[PDB]
Design an enzyme around this catalytic site. Sequence first.
Site, PDB file in Angstrom:
ATOM      1  N   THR A 130     -20.025  -1.811  30.864  1.00  0.00           N
ATOM      2  CA  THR A 130     -20.853  -0.733  31.378  1.00  0.00           C
ATOM      3  C   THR A 130     -21.915  -0.350  30.351  1.00  0.00           C
ATOM      4  O   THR A 130     -23.045  -0.056  30.715  1.00  0.00           O
ATOM      5  CB  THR A 130     -20.019   0.514  31.765  1.00  0.00           C
ATOM      6  OG1 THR A 130     -19.026   0.155  32.735  1.00  0.00           O
ATOM      7  CG2 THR A 130     -20.922   1.623  32.337  1.00  0.00           C
ATOM      8  N   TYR A 131     -21.553  -0.346  29.070  1.00  0.00           N
ATOM      9  CA  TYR A 131     -22.494   0.087  28.042  1.00  0.00           C
ATOM     10  C   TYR A 131     -23.221  -1.047  27.316  1.00  0.00           C
ATOM     11  O   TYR A 131     -24.079  -0.788  26.472  1.00  0.00           O
ATOM     12  CB  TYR A 131     -21.835   1.069  27.059  1.00  0.00           C
ATOM     13  CG  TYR A 131     -21.542   2.427  27.681  1.00  0.00           C
ATOM     14  CD1 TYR A 131     -20.275   2.735  28.170  1.00  0.00           C
ATOM     15  CD2 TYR A 131     -22.547   3.386  27.812  1.00  0.00           C
ATOM     16  CE1 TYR A 131     -20.009   3.969  28.749  1.00  0.00           C
ATOM     17  CE2 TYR A 131     -22.295   4.623  28.389  1.00  0.00           C
ATOM     18  CZ  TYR A 131     -21.024   4.911  28.858  1.00  0.00           C
ATOM     19  OH  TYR A 131     -20.764   6.139  29.435  1.00  0.00           O
ATOM     20  N   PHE A 171     -11.654  -9.074  16.540  1.00  0.00           N
ATOM     21  CA  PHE A 171     -11.650 -10.009  17.648  1.00  0.00           C
ATOM     22  C   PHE A 171     -10.220 -10.240  18.079  1.00  0.00           C
ATOM     23  O   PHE A 171      -9.340 -10.540  17.246  1.00  0.00           O
ATOM     24  CB  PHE A 171     -12.247 -11.342  17.207  1.00  0.00           C
ATOM     25  CG  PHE A 171     -12.318 -12.376  18.300  1.00  0.00           C
ATOM     26  CD1 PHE A 171     -11.475 -13.480  18.282  1.00  0.00           C
ATOM     27  CD2 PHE A 171     -13.259 -12.264  19.326  1.00  0.00           C
ATOM     28  CE1 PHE A 171     -11.546 -14.437  19.276  1.00  0.00           C
ATOM     29  CE2 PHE A 171     -13.345 -13.220  20.319  1.00  0.00           C
ATOM     30  CZ  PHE A 171     -12.486 -14.313  20.289  1.00  0.00           C
ATOM     31  N   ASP A 216      -8.917 -11.085  27.120  1.00  0.00           N
ATOM     32  CA  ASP A 216      -8.838  -9.814  27.865  1.00  0.00           C
ATOM     33  C   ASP A 216      -7.784  -9.836  28.976  1.00  0.00           C
ATOM     34  O   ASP A 216      -7.403 -10.907  29.446  1.00  0.00           O
ATOM     35  CB  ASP A 216     -10.213  -9.308  28.338  1.00  0.00           C
ATOM     36  CG  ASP A 216     -10.794 -10.111  29.504  1.00  0.00           C
ATOM     37  OD1 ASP A 216     -10.054 -10.718  30.293  1.00  0.00           O
ATOM     38  OD2 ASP A 216     -12.016 -10.102  29.651  1.00  0.00           O
ATOM     39  N   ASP A 249     -13.685   4.964  30.806  1.00  0.00           N
ATOM     40  CA  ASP A 249     -14.016   3.690  31.454  1.00  0.00           C
ATOM     41  C   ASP A 249     -12.933   2.618  31.552  1.00  0.00           C
ATOM     42  O   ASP A 249     -13.267   1.435  31.605  1.00  0.00           O
ATOM     43  CB  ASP A 249     -15.420   3.160  31.074  1.00  0.00           C
ATOM     44  CG  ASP A 249     -15.947   2.140  32.122  1.00  0.00           C
ATOM     45  OD1 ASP A 249     -15.432   2.113  33.262  1.00  0.00           O
ATOM     46  OD2 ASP A 249     -16.872   1.354  31.815  1.00  0.00           O
ATOM     47  N   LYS A 282     -10.324  -0.280  32.112  1.00  0.00           N
ATOM     48  CA  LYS A 282     -10.236  -1.327  33.112  1.00  0.00           C
ATOM     49  C   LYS A 282      -9.717  -2.593  32.450  1.00  0.00           C
ATOM     50  O   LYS A 282      -9.688  -2.674  31.226  1.00  0.00           O
ATOM     51  CB  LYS A 282     -11.597  -1.562  33.770  1.00  0.00           C
ATOM     52  CG  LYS A 282     -12.749  -1.797  32.818  1.00  0.00           C
ATOM     53  CD  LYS A 282     -13.919  -2.453  33.545  1.00  0.00           C
ATOM     54  CE  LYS A 282     -15.220  -1.735  33.281  1.00  0.00           C
ATOM     55  NZ  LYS A 282     -15.306  -1.405  31.852  1.00  0.00           N
TER      56      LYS A 282
HETATM   57  O1  LIG Z   1     -12.930 -14.144  28.041  1.00  0.00           O
HETATM   58  C1  LIG Z   1     -12.379 -14.479  26.959  1.00  0.00           C
HETATM   59  O2  LIG Z   1     -11.907 -15.647  26.822  1.00  0.00           O
HETATM   60  C2  LIG Z   1     -12.261 -13.494  25.837  1.00  0.00           C
HETATM   61  C3  LIG Z   1     -12.469 -12.115  25.998  1.00  0.00           C
HETATM   62  C4  LIG Z   1     -12.348 -11.258  24.897  1.00  0.00           C
HETATM   63  C5  LIG Z   1     -11.995 -11.788  23.647  1.00  0.00           C
HETATM   64  N1  LIG Z   1     -11.814 -11.010  22.455  1.00  0.00           N
HETATM   65  C6  LIG Z   1     -12.307  -9.679  22.269  1.00  0.00           C
HETATM   66  N2  LIG Z   1     -11.937  -9.037  21.162  1.00  0.00           N
HETATM   67  C7  LIG Z   1     -12.360  -7.787  20.919  1.00  0.00           C
HETATM   68  C8  LIG Z   1     -13.198  -7.180  21.853  1.00  0.00           C
HETATM   69  C9  LIG Z   1     -13.579  -7.860  23.004  1.00  0.00           C
HETATM   70  N3  LIG Z   1     -14.438  -7.256  23.975  1.00  0.00           N
HETATM   71  C10 LIG Z   1     -15.035  -5.958  23.775  1.00  0.00           C
HETATM   72  C11 LIG Z   1     -15.801  -5.695  22.641  1.00  0.00           C
HETATM   73  C12 LIG Z   1     -16.367  -4.441  22.484  1.00  0.00           C
HETATM   74  C13 LIG Z   1     -16.205  -3.450  23.449  1.00  0.00           C
HETATM   75  C14 LIG Z   1     -15.457  -3.711  24.584  1.00  0.00           C
HETATM   76  C15 LIG Z   1     -14.878  -4.964  24.739  1.00  0.00           C
HETATM   77 CL1  LIG Z   1     -13.948  -5.295  26.150  1.00  0.00          CL
HETATM   78  N4  LIG Z   1     -13.108  -9.115  23.177  1.00  0.00           N
HETATM   79  C16 LIG Z   1     -11.777 -13.152  23.517  1.00  0.00           C
HETATM   80  C17 LIG Z   1     -11.910 -13.997  24.599  1.00  0.00           C
END
Ligand SMILES: O=C(O)c1ccc(Nc2nccc(Nc3ccccc3Cl)n2)cc1
Length: 295
Positions: free
Chosen positions: A14-15, A79, A83, A124, A126
């Site tokens: 969203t942001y 990281f 998700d 937010d 989800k």
């Molecule tokens: O699809 C995939 O394979 C996948 C999705 C997420 C992954 N890691 C990860 N770490 C940390 C955060 C983050 N998102 C995020 C970052 C900042 C704010 C909000 C979100 Cl959701 N995402 C790794 C792989």
Amino acid sequence: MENFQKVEKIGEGTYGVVYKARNKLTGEVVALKKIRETEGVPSTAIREISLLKELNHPNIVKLLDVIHTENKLYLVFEFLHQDLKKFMDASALTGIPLPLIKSYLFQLLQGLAFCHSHRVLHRDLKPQNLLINTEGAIKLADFGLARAFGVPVRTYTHEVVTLWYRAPEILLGCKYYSTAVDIWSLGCIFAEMVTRRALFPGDSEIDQLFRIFRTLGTPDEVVWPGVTSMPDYKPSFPKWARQDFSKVVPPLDEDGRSLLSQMLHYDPNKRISAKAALAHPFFQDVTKPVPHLRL
Ligand SMILES: O=C(O)c1ccc(Nc2nccc(Nc3ccccc3Cl)n2)cc1
């Protein structure tokens, strides 16, 4: 930015958009979220978000840095591996085993109770912002954004925001949110893990509202004092009777359904707190299983 080898695009929130990125000098892999109105960035949100850097909890994704440069604002996060949305997609034929669902819910409640005790709201929540790792942990990402930044419609340009997890008081246009909005969203996610379908997949704000109404019954002053005086409330709303609840999440045993029903109360004042939820008998046998993740 110059600093990263910027591995890939992780997703779109969203942001703003999220990238997986590697720091050239340090080699550490991080998640990079670029925020964006773009008038140059509000100072007030910068300090407030910068404050979040002080959050340390096993169930919250660590915010490592907040970088304001040009018109863009970057949040650098630790990281994580996958998700919850992708994991649920991958588990769709089989289902997430109940002990793992329970473990995730327990952990998420702990993460919420921590944030809420620090007066930080998500607003937010989800599946896309819940992150899991190979060892069984789950973590909430992206707190405090809607309070600091104010809530726009989209990220910047033309994204379809998910309404599915929105609390009813939000849909009815209440100006003041409470921590209860996050309990509601978590309740929707819990239900979705169990049944492998979204609980309230509304197409629009009104469809979202009416889906909630058809399931839980159209709220009135009895179950929700003050509901008829809310800004978007109309006396013309159809009146649906509440559905038998065992139809909502059939796989779930009665402890799970009772906990779920308390997370889904219309009146944010009657809705269970994360802290009280952690004491629910549903969690008596909680353990920490390891997921099977395809990375
Ligand atoms: O699809 C995939 O394979 C996948 C999705 C997420 C992954 N890691 C990860 N770490 C940390 C955060 C983050 N998102 C995020 C970052 C900042 C704010 C909000 C979100 Cl959701 N995402 C790794 C792989």
